[PDB]
Amino acid sequence: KVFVDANRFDIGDLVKASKLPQRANEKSAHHSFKQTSRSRDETCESNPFPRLNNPKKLEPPKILSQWSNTIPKTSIFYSVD
Amino acid sequence: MNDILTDYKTFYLTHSNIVTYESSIIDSNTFDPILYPELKMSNPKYDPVDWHKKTEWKEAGHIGITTERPQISNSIIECNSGTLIQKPISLPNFRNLEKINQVKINDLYTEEFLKE
Amino acid sequence: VFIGGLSSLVTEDELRAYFQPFGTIVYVKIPVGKCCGFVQYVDRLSAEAAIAGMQGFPIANSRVRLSWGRSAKQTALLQQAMLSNSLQVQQQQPGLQQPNYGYIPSSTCEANVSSTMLPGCQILNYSNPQQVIMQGSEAVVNSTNAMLNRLEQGSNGFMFA
Amino acid sequence: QSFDIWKNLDRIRSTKKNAGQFIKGSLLILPMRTEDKQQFDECMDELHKYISKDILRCYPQKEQKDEGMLFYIVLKDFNILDSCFVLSVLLAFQKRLWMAPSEKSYFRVPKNINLTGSFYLPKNIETGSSIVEVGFNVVPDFQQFQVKACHVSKFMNELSNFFSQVEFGKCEANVINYFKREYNRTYSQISLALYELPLIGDGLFDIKSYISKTRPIIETSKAQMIKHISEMKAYNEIS
Amino acid sequence: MDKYTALIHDENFSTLTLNVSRYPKSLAYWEKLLNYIVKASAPICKSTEPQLLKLIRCTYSSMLNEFPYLENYYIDFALLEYKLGNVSMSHKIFQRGLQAFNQRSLLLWTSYLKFCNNVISHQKQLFKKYETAEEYVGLHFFSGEFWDLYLEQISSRCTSSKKYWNVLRKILEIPLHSFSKFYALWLQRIDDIMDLKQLSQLTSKDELLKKLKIDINYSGRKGPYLQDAKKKLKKITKEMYMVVQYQVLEIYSIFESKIYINYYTSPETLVSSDEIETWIKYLDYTITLQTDSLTHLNFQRALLPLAHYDLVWIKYSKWLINSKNDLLGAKNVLLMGLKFSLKKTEIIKLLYSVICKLNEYVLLRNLLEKIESSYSDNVENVDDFEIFWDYLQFKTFCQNSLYSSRYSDSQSNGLLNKELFDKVWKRLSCKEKKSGQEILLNNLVQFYSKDTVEFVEKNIFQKIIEFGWEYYLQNGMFWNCYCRLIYFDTSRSYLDKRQYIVRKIWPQIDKKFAQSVLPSLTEFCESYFPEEMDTLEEMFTEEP
Known part of the structure; x- marks a missing residue:
């Protein structure tokens, strides 16, 4: 209801309104992936346990490549994979 | 010590009144027999009442492994930005910039037990 | 934990009595006369709390030296592969295969269950020596009752721990 | 010094370098509580005689508990002394019931006692020890202050040293109705949190479906811990 | 028929509303009820039926009064009221959203500032709101979005470009998740400088002239001296980069890698065994650094995933007691922790102690009335003993302090006040159905006096014998306590207390019960009466 950006109550109608006609068949016939339209009607019940559905760890913090040699060369704890 | 503190709190609550308790409170030890047993339970070495060189700072994220961590001497992150504009900010003073790679370990195990 | 610098006049039960309220505890074996012991907890959190809380505390009038240190198997392995001085490489201690949902670490329960399994309570726990018990309702009654037992029997001399 | 309020008050009148002219806005x-109202009314009636009615008002709550009355004490436009007088009298009187039940003189404060309580100021203050602020205050607009366990003379001395520094500004006319409404909202919330203490399992939690939702994961968790102990037993075993 | 009447006569509405009104603290019923009412107005605009807008507002307001830590629904309710025409209400919705989070939530400040940029249209007031958000939720580890939003407003409104350099130098020392972007801004903005008078935008001119040996008013050839200037300032920024990179990479590798869930979820959710451990370690880390905004923020940040668990409510309160010495702060943390945590017993036990140490006893005397009125004056019959015993200790402390001592040699009458002894006796009368009978017995034998012990022996122990109740006669702790009452009495001599025990307690115990009573009574006779051990063994020998 907040982050989808198509179900937002303030800019909700504008995103659907400015989708464009796509009067080209081959414009939709180009891409063969899924759309993944998350509806506004979704609830708390689905995905009851977030860890068991396979999660991703957050990416490590990006650093400047020109100063990439000034990093500490060894970490503290032995971490695997 | 946990058994004695629990049973003495249970005893004091049922055998003593407020006129005894408020005259039992002395401030140099901040001792109070109602709450002090509740805080002194699991840690025995409890004193009731230059930070950057204690042995709680140096091994903060990781116990036993001591590293002097680099830090800025006069950091401004406690200062609001409503008060940084009033006068221009000085350059940072650094401390411990030689030791971003040095980490040192007191290995009691190997010395006192493997090699006797 | 490697507890070093012991008096050598301290037993294993008396050493279990110090290090037990920090968290549940798998084993407390100590060598015969090396003046140093070995305590192993279930949790990493409880072991770190024990090293913080019990550092330099005197057990039978000798300031104790707490630090990390491996098991008995790994110590025999390192000792024979150090007398042969070949590699002396160690092996990582086993994980809990997380996500684990019942357990709230650093928690002790000493001894029919219809528990409502809600978040604030505790559902599962490690038994004290070992197996896994469903946490009952009446933890405080059994705990408080055992400590009144421990006070009245320890004052007369039936447990020095 | 002595334990009579008037000697301490005349000391703090003489030595405090414009202790008279008041604080703007x-x-x-x-907010103070009492078990019985009839003991309270004598102290508050003598107190009302000495201090101007406009300066000090007492707002009773609606008597919703009907056992413990909750009277707000409000000092509007007080001097640097009036604050010391009213705070010393009330902070002694609400502790007179427990420790000194026999003395019974509402302006003389016996020496076994120490003054301890708390007061609220608005947040729009500028301060530019024995009185400290709080962290994590619970009323959304006001700044809870704590006074920790002092004599009567040190209480007067530290109240004057505190109200010299502080500098108020520009509240509404009926901000006191806002504080009444807000503090009653907060303690209605914690009373209605204590009324949910029996009713946790099946009272309002649809436990019939929650158990069926988190039964297999407790079961796999128990499997993982049994596997953990067997694995750790094989790790420690010399064999 | 219109949308409202049509919605009311629908069949689903009675079912969804009865499931919400039966099971309040389950979240999925609330969200089903809410999605149904919103879908029942398929165009939402300014002309939809006011009897139905009043009901959508009552639904959202009542849900958010039930589940106050739901971050996304404050944003959504405020954006709904912003659609419906009035920004004046949406300000209040965001501000109660921030206040229920005690001002330390990152998402409500970020959405409130991206809201407030459009509608506040007064520059110094909008910048006072950004300074407020900075002093509460500035040092958040993921607050790159807040600071980048703030720099966007500064670079679009201001014409001076001094405030940008000021704010950016404050970004440079904060350990953020994505600090390399806020370093690259500083690097390209130093590299985009043109002449020597603009080096005083960073620091003062005397700081440059002392620390970096550089004169702004060096007039002459100013090419090489400006290039020397840029290299020396880039070196200082490289060193401060090393310090912030170390702190960021240390926090990330140890603690922030392991937390996967940062959101409130629902009161029925369980938090993993991993993340309880890493939140306890990460709060213990944060307390060491002695930055206070970051510590309050990390406690309020850890109360999103496990607000209900209550590990944090107690750890945060003990931090306010013994590390910072702000004890009303730790009373208020537990007062707010009663509302969220489901296991209230440990917080109420600590809370009583905190209230007693503050010398605010009328608050204790009033707080005990809410427990002894929440069970409707029948706390003597409570299922869990842990509530009753914590109740009874502090009620005994108050009951001794009201009524002065009734017995001699200055002894406060403890459990044996006639108002408390009834609460004891109605629980000892249930006899096995209620747990924790032995501790009531064992806490009633500490009197050690003449008439006090005579009261206890005349009222509980003799009366359990007189009724002949089988649970206590069977149980060896009862006879151990009834011996240990008389033997530690300091009013008798040795001979009469030993003769009283062996001649008039030990005959009364029934020989059919001896297999349970003798292991508990044998430890007593072995500890205190080694001489009279053979009498006890021959009273219960296997052959009469």
């Missing part, structure tokens, strides 16, 4: 609210 200064309002202090101290």
Whole structure:
């Protein structure tokens, strides 16, 4: 209801309104992936346990490549994979 | 010590009144027999009442492994930005910039037990 | 934990009595006369709390030296592969295969269950020596009752721990 | 010094370097509780005689508990002394019931006692020890202050040293109705949190479906811990 | 028929509303009820039926009064009221959203500032709101979005470009998740400088002239001296980069890698065994650094995933007691922790102690009335003993302090006040159905006096014998306590207390019960009466 950006109550109608006609068949016939339209009607019940559905760890913090040699060369704890 | 503190709190609550308790409170030890047993339970070495060189700072994220961590001497992150504009900010003073790679370990195990 | 610098006049039960309220505890074996012991907890959190809380505390009038240190198997392995001085490489201690949902670490329960399994309570726990018990309702009654037992029997001399 | 309020008060009148002229737009609210009302009314009636009615008002709550009355004490536009007088009298009187039940003189404060309580100031203060602020205050607009366990003379001395520094500004006319409404909202919330203490399992939690939702994961968790102990037993075993 | 009447006569509405009104603290019923009412107005605009807008507002307001830590629904309710025409209400919705989070939530400040940029249209007031958000939720580890939003407003409104350099130098020392972007801004903005008078935008001119040996008013050839200037300032920024990179990479590798869930979820959710451990370690880390905004923020940040668990409510309160010495702060943390945590017993036990140490006893005397009125004056019959015993200790402390001592040699009458002894006796009368009978017995034998012990022996122990109740006669702790009452009495001599025990307690115990009573009574006779051990063994020998 907040982050989808198509179900937002303030800019909700504008995103659907400015989708464009796509009067080209081959414009939709180009891409063969899924759309993944998350509806506004979704609830708390689905995905009851977030860890068991396979999660991703957050990416490590990006650093400047020109100063990439000034990093500490060894970490503290032995971490695997 | 946990058994004695629990049973003495249970005893004091049922055998003593407020006129005894408020005259039992002395401030140099901040001792109070109602709450002090509740805080002194699991840690025995409890004193009731230059930070950057204690042995709680140096091994903060990781116990036993001591590293002097680099830090800025006069950091401004406690200062609001409503008060940084009033006068221009000085350059940072650094401390411990030689030791971003040095980490040192007191290995009691190997010395006192493997090699006797 | 490697507890070093012991008096050598301290037993294993008396050493279990110090290090037990920090968290549940798998084993407390100590060598015969090396003046140093070995305590192993279930949790990493409880072991770190024990090293913080019990550092330099005197057990039978000798300031104790707490630090990390491996098991008995790994110590025999390192000792024979150090007398042969070949590699002396160690092996990582086993994980809990997380996500684990019942357990709230650093928690002790000493001894029919219809528990409502809600978040604030505790559902599962490690038994004290070992197996896994469903946490009952009446933890405080059994705990408080055992400590009144421990006070009245320890004052007369039936447990020095 | 002595334990008579008037000697301490005349000391703090003489030595405090413009202890008279008041503080602009200064309002202090101290909510205090008593078991019995009839003991309270004598202290508050003598107190009302000495201090101007406009300066000090007592707002009773609606008597919703009907056992413990909750009277707000409000000092609007007080001087540097009036605050010391009212705070010393009330902070002694609400502790007179427990420790000194026999003495019974509402302006003389016996020496076994120490003054301890708390008062609220508005947040729009500028301060530019024995009185400290709080962290994590619970009323959304006001700044809870704590006074920790002092003599009567050190209480007067530290109240004057505190109200010299502080500098108030520009509240509404009926901000006191806002504090009344807000503090009653907060303690209605914690009373209605204590009324949910029996009703946790199946009272309002649809436990019939929650158990069926988190039964297999407790079961796999128990499997993982049994596997953990067997694995750790094989790790420690010399064999 | 219109949308409202049509919605009311629908069949689903009675079912969804009865499931919400039966099971309040389950979240999925609330969200089903809410999605149904919103879908029942398929165009939402300014002309939809006011009897139905009043009901959508009552639904959202009542849900958010039930589940106050739901971050996304404050944003959504405020954006709904912003659609419906009035920004004046949406300000209040965001501000109660921030206040229920005690001002330390990152998402409500970020959405409130991206809201407030459009509608506040007064520059110094909008910048006072950004300074407020900075002093509460500035040092958040993921607050790159807040600071980048703030720099966007500064670079679009201001014409001076001094405030940008000021704010950016404050970004440079904060350990953020994505600090390399806020370093690259500083690097390209130093590299985009043109002449020597603009080096005083960073620091003062005397700081440059002392620390970096550089004169702004060096007039002459100013090419090489400006290039020397840029290299020396880039070196200082490289060193401060090393310090912030170390702190960021240390926090990330140890603690922030392991937390996967940062959101409130629902009161029925369980938090993993991993993340309880890493939140306890990460709060213990944060307390060491002695930055206070970051510590309050990390406690309020850890109360999103496990607000209900209550590990944090107690750890945060003990931090306010013994590390910072702000004890009303730790009373208020537990007062707010009663509302969220489901296991209230440990917080109420600590809370009583905190209230007693503050010398605010009328608050204790009033707080005990809410427990002894929440069970409707029948706390003597409570299922869990842990509530009753914590109740009874502090009620005994108050009951001794009201009524002065009734017995001699200055002894406060403890459990044996006639108002408390009834609460004891109605629980000892249930006899096995209620747990924790032995501790009531064992806490009633500490009197050690003449008439006090005579009261206890005349009222509980003799009366359990007189009724002949089988649970206590069977149980060896009862006879151990009834011996240990008389033997530690300091009013008798040795001979009469030993003769009283062996001649008039030990005959009364029934020989059919001896297999349970003798292991508990044998430890007593072995500890205190080694001489009279053979009498006890021959009273219960296997052959009469």
